Amino acid sequence: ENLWVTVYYGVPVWKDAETTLFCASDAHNVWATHACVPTDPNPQEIHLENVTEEFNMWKNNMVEQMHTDIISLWDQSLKPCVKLTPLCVTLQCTNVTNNITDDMRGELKNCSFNMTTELRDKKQKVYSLFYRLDVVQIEYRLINCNTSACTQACPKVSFEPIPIHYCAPAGFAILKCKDKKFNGTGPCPSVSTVQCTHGIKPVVSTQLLLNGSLAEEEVMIRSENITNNAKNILVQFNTPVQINCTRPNNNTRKSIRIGPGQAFYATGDIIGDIRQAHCNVSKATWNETLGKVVKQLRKHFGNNTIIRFANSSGGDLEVTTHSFNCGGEFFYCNTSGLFNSTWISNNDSITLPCRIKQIINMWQRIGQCMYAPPIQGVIRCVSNITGLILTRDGGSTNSTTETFRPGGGDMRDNWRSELYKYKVVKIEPLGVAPTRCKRRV
Amino acid sequence: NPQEIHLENVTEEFNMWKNNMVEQMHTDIISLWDQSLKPCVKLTPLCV
Amino acid sequence: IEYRLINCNTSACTQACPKVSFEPIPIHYCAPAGF
Amino acid sequence: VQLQESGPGLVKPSQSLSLTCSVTGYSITSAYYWNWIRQFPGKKLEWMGYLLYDGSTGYNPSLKNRISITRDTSKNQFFLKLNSVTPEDTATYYCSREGNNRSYWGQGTTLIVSS
Amino acid sequence: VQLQESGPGLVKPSQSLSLTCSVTGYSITSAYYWNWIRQFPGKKLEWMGYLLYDGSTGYNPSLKNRISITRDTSKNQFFLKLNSVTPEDTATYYCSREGNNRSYWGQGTTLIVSS
Amino acid sequence: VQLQESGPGLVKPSQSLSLTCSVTGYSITSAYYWNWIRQFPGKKLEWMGYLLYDGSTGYNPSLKNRISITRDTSKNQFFLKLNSVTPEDTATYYCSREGNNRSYWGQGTTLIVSS
Amino acid sequence: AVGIGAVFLGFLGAAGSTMGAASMTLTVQARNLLSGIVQQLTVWGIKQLQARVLAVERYLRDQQLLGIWGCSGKLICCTNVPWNSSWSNRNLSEIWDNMTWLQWDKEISNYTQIIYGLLEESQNQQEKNEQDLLA
Amino acid sequence: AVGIGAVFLGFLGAAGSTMGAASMTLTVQARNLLSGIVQQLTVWGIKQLQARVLAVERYLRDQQLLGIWGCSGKLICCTNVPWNSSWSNRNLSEIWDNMTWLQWDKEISNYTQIIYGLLEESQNQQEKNEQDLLA
Amino acid sequence: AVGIGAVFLGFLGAAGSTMGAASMTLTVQARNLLSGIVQQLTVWGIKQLQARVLAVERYLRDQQLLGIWGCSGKLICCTNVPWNSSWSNRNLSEIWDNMTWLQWDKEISNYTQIIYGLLEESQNQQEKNEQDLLA
Amino acid sequence: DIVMTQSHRFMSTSVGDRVSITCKASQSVDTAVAWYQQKPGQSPKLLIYWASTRHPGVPDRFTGSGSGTDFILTISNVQSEDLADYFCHQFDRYPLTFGDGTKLEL
Ligand SMILES: *[C@@H]1O[C@H](CO)[C@@H](O[C@@H]2O[C@H](CO)[C@@H](O[C@@H]3O[C@H](CO[C@H]4O[C@H](CO)[C@@H](O)[C@H](O)[C@@H]4O)[C@@H](O)[C@H](O[C@H]4O[C@H](CO)[C@@H](O)[C@H](O)[C@@H]4O)[C@@H]3O)[C@H](O)[C@H]2NC(C)=O)[C@H](O)[C@H]1NC(C)=O
Ligand SMILES: *[C@@H]1O[C@H](CO)[C@@H](O[C@@H]2O[C@H](CO)[C@@H](O[C@@H]3O[C@H](CO[C@H]4O[C@H](CO)[C@@H](O)[C@H](O)[C@@H]4O)[C@@H](O)[C@H](O)[C@@H]3O)[C@H](O)[C@H]2NC(C)=O)[C@H](O)[C@H]1NC(C)=O
Ligand SMILES: *[C@@H]1O[C@H](CO)[C@@H](O[C@@H]2O[C@H](CO)[C@@H](O[C@@H]3O[C@H](CO)[C@@H](O)[C@H](O)[C@@H]3O)[C@H](O)[C@H]2NC(C)=O)[C@H](O)[C@H]1NC(C)=O
Ligand SMILES: *[C@@H]1O[C@H](CO)[C@@H](O[C@@H]2O[C@H](CO)[C@@H](O[C@@H]3O[C@H](CO)[C@@H](O)[C@H](O)[C@@H]3O)[C@H](O)[C@H]2NC(C)=O)[C@H](O)[C@H]1NC(C)=O
Ligand SMILES: *[C@@H]1O[C@H](CO)[C@@H](O[C@@H]2O[C@H](CO)[C@@H](O)[C@H](O)[C@H]2NC(C)=O)[C@H](O)[C@H]1NC(C)=O
Ligand SMILES: *[C@@H]1O[C@H](CO)[C@@H](O[C@@H]2O[C@H](CO)[C@@H](O)[C@H](O)[C@H]2NC(C)=O)[C@H](O)[C@H]1NC(C)=O
Ligand SMILES: *[C@@H]1O[C@H](CO)[C@@H](O[C@@H]2O[C@H](CO)[C@@H](O)[C@H](O)[C@H]2NC(C)=O)[C@H](O)[C@H]1NC(C)=O
Ligand SMILES: *[C@@H]1O[C@H](CO)[C@@H](O[C@@H]2O[C@H](CO)[C@@H](O)[C@H](O)[C@H]2NC(C)=O)[C@H](O)[C@H]1NC(C)=O
Ligand SMILES: *[C@@H]1O[C@H](CO)[C@@H](O[C@@H]2O[C@H](CO)[C@@H](O)[C@H](O)[C@H]2NC(C)=O)[C@H](O)[C@H]1NC(C)=O
Ligand SMILES: *[C@@H]1O[C@H](CO)[C@@H](O)[C@H](O)[C@H]1NC(C)=O
Ligand SMILES: *[C@@H]1O[C@H](CO)[C@@H](O)[C@H](O)[C@H]1NC(C)=O
Ligand SMILES: *[C@@H]1O[C@H](CO)[C@@H](O)[C@H](O)[C@H]1NC(C)=O
Ligand SMILES: *[C@@H]1O[C@H](CO)[C@@H](O)[C@H](O)[C@H]1NC(C)=O
Ligand SMILES: *[C@@H]1O[C@H](CO)[C@@H](O)[C@H](O)[C@H]1NC(C)=O
Ligand SMILES: *[C@@H]1O[C@H](CO)[C@@H](O)[C@H](O)[C@H]1NC(C)=O
Ligand SMILES: *[C@@H]1O[C@H](CO)[C@@H](O)[C@H](O)[C@H]1NC(C)=O
Ligand SMILES: *[C@@H]1O[C@H](CO)[C@@H](O)[C@H](O)[C@H]1NC(C)=O
């Protein structure tokens, strides 16, 4: 009559545990390297009703998994390239006067040096055009010459972001939230399971998120405890804001060899006119998108407050300005034209000036390089703005009339808007249950 | 002692030029050839 | 061009570590467990 | 999931009709029902038969023994063969996957049975 | 497998007869049964004994204690010794492979027992 | 093993006394007995209760239901809670490790029960 | 009941279903504890090997522990260990057909060790009892 | 039965044998599924480790479905599931002694997934029926 | 027998006791055959993975050899095969209460290959007899 | 052989009127009845499952009801995008069987 203990093997039990993931991709590149197992394209999406799981981003280790993994994928794809140690010879740089406007004055330098031919006893005179951000005074020398040498990053490969699928082996499952009004943390009443997720673009940026995923219904603001002014406010759009970025210079490529079997593609002379690279966005679309943000921003604050937009707070060009990698050439864009607005209660293009820097310290690690070779021909770039990273400025008096400023820099937040709904759990198939039993002796 | 077990009363379809025995060992000793060249010292200044 | 090595416009060579030899000692391939 | 039908668009009477359904985005060896459905001129639908995930078969009795349904699991394809065709069997042939309150249809293909 | 008999072709009466069978192509320590068989003048065969992979020995009882059979597993050879020989023991001595419905014989060697 | 007691050194009468024993150098999920022992003014020892590695609880009957002892196995800590305290419960509280003729004690902490 | 009404239950589909309704769902859970990487350098070479061994020895950990209790080769077995009134003060009607497995493990998560230790001691108790009657 | 008729089957020696004669030979084909690498840098740190863990995962895959069917640890398990006659229209005398097992597997290669999934559907029902009669 | 006098023998503690004293402690010894490295660069990159798969393959070889004999899932299993007395002409009183398993192995280490091979021929014979009788 | 008889084949309607479609089953079997929508040049799309519940993305103006041998689908506030063919179907026992179909005209 009294109850008895049982053993059940294969029971659904979830505990929040995190382990390493595994790559997958669809059908040579820097991201995939033809090494991930080509997954079967069936993310079998089993809906699980009557279950509420407490999701928690900003503590998920999958974000820290992908940040660490692509660093290991970056140095792995730079080893068969050529070291750029002998580029720290002296330079004789003069300004360019071949059909240049006043806005590009002191930006391109016509240099010359004594770099070595593949025969050790023979030298050559090689001229190339470097940007002002790539050379420093001593006449001129490269910026990296007091840091480690560079790599030139093997221009046969491309920098187009191939989508990368992360999914754990057996014994672990991935649960995703499906709420239309989903905030950051807290429980989700629409928890379902997928064995292996969808395509995630590893594209990097600093201020504005590009080529991301759109929200379901409205512009959604995903932040933790809001009274911090040292933490970034993640804003995801509901509509795609198209951005038009071009480089109007017809660049050529001069292939001059540094050693035996070692090539170095310098910049040739510029044919045509010298013009500024710029990014164009729609003024009418961006004003509509900013209208939707401030309505959702005032949900978390007072209704009579004054929300003011402003540019970045200054610093080095790596963290202050925007960055994207379309076309293979780096772009650093002055985004002070997209944040000059104040908001109180109740024409087809915005020209953002953009600098081009060839030699790049890519991530926060300082002892590396990114010597992007010049790309032959003009650059055409069309993308969608799908997110913002905003840092609230301090010094607010009486909790009113606060201002919002962009920022970022750390690459954690660039993928926190793409892994916000995902978590990984560990499955124990063992369990017990009460019913009536006597073993057959 | 390479133990060989004879199987009579059985047939099998052999297909040459398509087995991975040829393809792997061509890849295998190429990796065995590049591995033994790493401790060798380079001849970069021989191009004078 | 007076003269130069034929692979000077390609990557440099190595002298093949003359301590070891090139004589092929026979090897035997085996299947793993279950094969 | 994406389904794509392929095969000859003209079949002579009394000969055999063969069609291929190429499936992508999902594995035919895991779950649900994998069907062939056709639409006649005049917008009428007639169900011909199905398949289980384990490769079991079943057919509409009205088609008698005229239908064998088969699959190739290496290519993730399944196949229709229809014997002894008549011009009143001319119709637009769909391969569809149904189950768990999820119904997905291919774009369909057109076939004419004439001499 | 190939078997080759060797040893002296002439043995004095009452002395000991020793022969070597050299085996190549297969290991005698994971294996079948290895026999000695001789053929008399007039083409009659008499089986003397066998060996196993585990070292166990077996002999025809008719030969009493006259025969010890031994092996060297390093050289993959096994050996016949025959004590107290007579001229009626003159015969062509074979070392044989038998088993699994397979039967292989050496070419044999000739031995004459005379003074 | 090292044991370190922690918690508030002053507790108001009739309220609850909570102490933490932080254990390092040994796992609380493997073996032996894990005890709380206190020493009164005048050098007298009274055993209050113990724990086992499997989570079983036992207490001195003289303390009635006044004691619940609980643990957190993730932090490798175990805990004392004492309800309905009196000034005659003022004492130096030790968490000690006993078994296999081994005996290790923490340094102890002082607590005074007064208003 | 068939066609679009047919139920194939997926994987982990009994998470929200009740404990009584999940008593027939034990098969589909156990088949996903080993497979997944059946189709195929430092990066992504050691990362699979570290994950492959971990997915195997945890399965062997839960299978060896089943064999110590005498539950090897069975999915739903039940022993003679008496679970008592202090662990859960509820009847069988208040456990099976009105709540699910997911939050049932949270109340027993403190008492998981005391349950596991008594089962391995009780099996070895009846091994010697089998020796006495057999002789 | 001796001499040329002795038994020296070894590994896979009953491959071309009849099914009655090969039914005695299931013992010798089981031990050579994990051994061979019992005794012991980029190359062969992966070429050896990837094949060693693959032999473990293939062995535990075969044992686990042998456990889901309810008769793990038995070399010859014969369960209580009826079989459809459409898979093979041959009686007992036309299977066990006239044909080799190798070509038989190709005949039931198409109908493998039907019979491999029906076994565990009648085993969970068997364990549920065992629970009702026991209490 | 309580407090400091309780039994907390742990792993490998009964390696110096008698035959009957060590037979009750088989559970705690087999517990440490898989775990221990449950909590987690070239060096110790291949050494760590070779550490585990070597340990997994020995445990699987012991369970598979136990499963061939039909004693899978049991800690103290006993068969019905006779053994010749030439290996040890000692009665149960002089062996099971006064000597240790360590010195017992060296006296029968000559015959472990013989006594293991007599078990799969024994176990397959009931399965042959089960097939004849039950059909 | 459950036989499904539909009321009419072609019906003329105006924008803004409530319209109700009916389907009569030969036997009283279950409430597991589905409606499919098919627009010209497109494959049919499932609309209602289990006679009373709606699918994701389906607009609120679509409702259904009925049991036994009588099953009623009601369209309310008909717009231009609802021009299509609708079919009452059942999924209880094989063989699957389809209705004749109703064509809407505006
Ligand atoms: C290393 O080796 C030594 C000596 O060989 C072991 O020590 C004891 O060895 C004896 C010999 O077999 C064990 O046998 C016991 O004899 C008891 C009576 O003999 C005397 O025992 C002690 C002196 O050792 C005296 O105090 C006592 O008055 C007797 O004069 C029996 O009573 C025992 O039977 C049962 O006794 C009680 C009854 O409940 C149980 O607690 C026992 O476990 C046992 O079931 C027994 O026959 C004796 O057990 C050994 N001592 C101990 C403490 O185990 C060492 O044990 C050995 N080391 C190890 C690790 O095994
Ligand atoms: C966000 O996603 C956008 C959509 O993919 C990205 O835009 C694409 O960016 C790539 C650069 O990586 C462009 O590729 C270039 O294309 C030109 C000319 O394209 C022609 O050739 C290709 C290939 O044959 C063909 O597919 C086209 O149709 C054209 O016929 C080449 O000359 C370049 O070498 C380079 O391959 C894409 O063209 C471009 N897409 C579009 C529609 O313009 C965008 O870059 C992403 N954002 C970021 C920041 O990466
Ligand atoms: C930036 O945003 C625009 C949104 O305007 C993206 O346009 C997308 O373009 C693709 C291809 O043209 C569309 O896919 C197709 O949509 C039609 C719609 O009927 C569908 O019938 C086809 O089967 C196909 O799926 C896609 O819908 C469209 N996006 C939206 C929201 O309409 C553009 O791709 C975005 N750029 C990047 C880089 O993401
Ligand atoms: C390949 O095929 C031939 C048949 O042509 C096989 O010969 C068969 O050998 C077995 C050896 O065990 C014979 O079985 C024996 O049968 C007798 C009764 O005649 C019985 O007393 C013995 O105990 C034993 O079971 C079998 O009869 C014989 N077949 C025929 C038709 O005579 C040959 O062995 C096959 N090769 C293999 C299996 O490797
Ligand atoms: C980005 O926007 C600027 C601003 O309109 C565009 O510059 C115009 O270029 C045309 C040449 O076709 C000139 O006729 C106009 O006078 C320019 N505008 C101004 C205000 O000077 C530029 O072409 C745009 N770039 C792209 C790629 O759309
Ligand atoms: C961005 O540049 C494109 C030019 O490539 C502008 O023109 C659009 O071009 C696409 C495809 O070439 C068409 O589908 C659009 O209809 C074009 N737009 C218009 C208004 O005609 C596009 O307008 C630019 N967008 C912005 C925001 O500047
Ligand atoms: C953000 O915009 C403000 C303009 O309001 C910039 O402030 C100017 O900075 C320049 C530096 O070259 C000074 O010469 C001007 O006097 C400043 N303006 C005023 C009104 O003081 C500020 O530098 C911008 N910040 C960034 C990071 O771009
Ligand atoms: C980004 O662009 C804005 C304007 O396009 C720059 O702001 C100008 O800064 C100069 C510096 O003295 C002022 O003289 C101008 O009056 C400013 N413009 C306006 C409209 O007020 C800004 O400096 C640029 N950012 C950087 C980092 O240079
Ligand atoms: C999710 O919970 C609901 C509770 O409303 C379950 O609905 C019950 O389902 C059973 C049979 O499945 C019926 O007998 C009950 O009448 C339903 N209603 C109740 C209990 O109020 C639903 O089944 C659950 N989902 C799953 C997958 O089990
Ligand atoms: C070149 O540009 C720099 C930029 O500041 C300027 O200082 C220098 O005077 C310029 N030289 C000539 C010759 O124009
Ligand atoms: C290169 O070397 C020559 C010889 O020393 C020297 O005349 C010339 O100025 C050097 N080039 C540069 C750019 O300094
Ligand atoms: C290299 O020199 C520049 C010139 O001032 C300086 O700004 C930079 O900090 C130096 N880099 C390092 C790593 O010291
Ligand atoms: C969703 O937002 C935050 C999570 O960051 C949470 O604290 C809050 O309670 C939720 N609800 C609303 C209405 O913000
Ligand atoms: C951060 O969160 C805590 C909640 O623990 C809250 O009390 C606090 O106000 C928040 N902000 C800051 C600046 O600490
Ligand atoms: C840029 O101009 C040069 C001038 O010679 C021309 O050869 C080249 O094709 C142009 N490139 C593009 C993309 O128009
Ligand atoms: C740079 O200087 C060299 C010197 O001969 C000249 O040929 C070349 O045209 C110059 N390029 C530019 C862009 O001024
Ligand atoms: C942008 O929106 C604001 C909202 O207050 C409005 O005041 C302003 O005139 C708008 N600007 C344009 C160019 O539409």
Ligand SMILES: *[C@@H]1O[C@H](CO)[C@@H](O)[C@H](O)[C@H]1NC(C)=O
């Ligand atoms: C702001 O206005 C909204 C109406 O859109 C109202 O729901 C909300 O309560 C208001 N906020 C405060 C703080 O009153």
Ligand SMILES: *[C@@H]1O[C@H](CO)[C@@H](O)[C@H](O)[C@H]1NC(C)=O
């Ligand atoms: C914002 O734009 C207006 C446009 O006239 C300009 O007058 C003002 O100076 C700008 N403010 C900033 C901070 O750039």
Ligand SMILES: *[C@@H]1O[C@H](CO)[C@@H](O)[C@H](O)[C@H]1NC(C)=O
């Ligand atoms: C290197 O020079 C040789 C000599 O003529 C030539 O055959 C070969 O093609 C050259 N290779 C390259 C990459 O220039």
Ligand SMILES: *[C@@H]1O[C@H](CO)[C@@H](O)[C@H](O)[C@H]1NC(C)=O
């Ligand atoms: C289980 O343990 C935790 C922490 O030790 C405790 O907070 C909780 O109250 C315990 N549950 C029960 C039912 O005692």
Ligand SMILES: *[C@@H]1O[C@H](CO)[C@@H](O)[C@H](O)[C@H]1NC(C)=O
């Ligand atoms: C707990 O169970 C044990 C037996 O397993 C029993 O002796 C004990 O009395 C139970 N506890 C209570 C409080 O009844």
Ligand SMILES: *[C@@H]1O[C@H](CO)[C@@H](O)[C@H](O)[C@H]1NC(C)=O
């Ligand atoms: C089994 O399948 C193959 C290919 O799928 C086919 O050729 C063969 O005829 C089938 N066998 C039977 C008996 O249906």
Ligand SMILES: *[C@@H]1O[C@H](CO)[C@@H](O)[C@H](O)[C@H]1NC(C)=O
């Ligand atoms: C006696 O022992 C021998 C070992 O040499 C064995 O072969 C034989 O079968 C044994 N006899 C019995 C009756 O067990």
Ligand SMILES: *[C@@H]1O[C@H](CO)[C@@H](O)[C@H](O)[C@H]1NC(C)=O
């Ligand atoms: C078994 O063999 C070993 C090693 O050859 C030997 O030490 C031992 O004495 C043998 N056993 C017997 C009972 O002689």
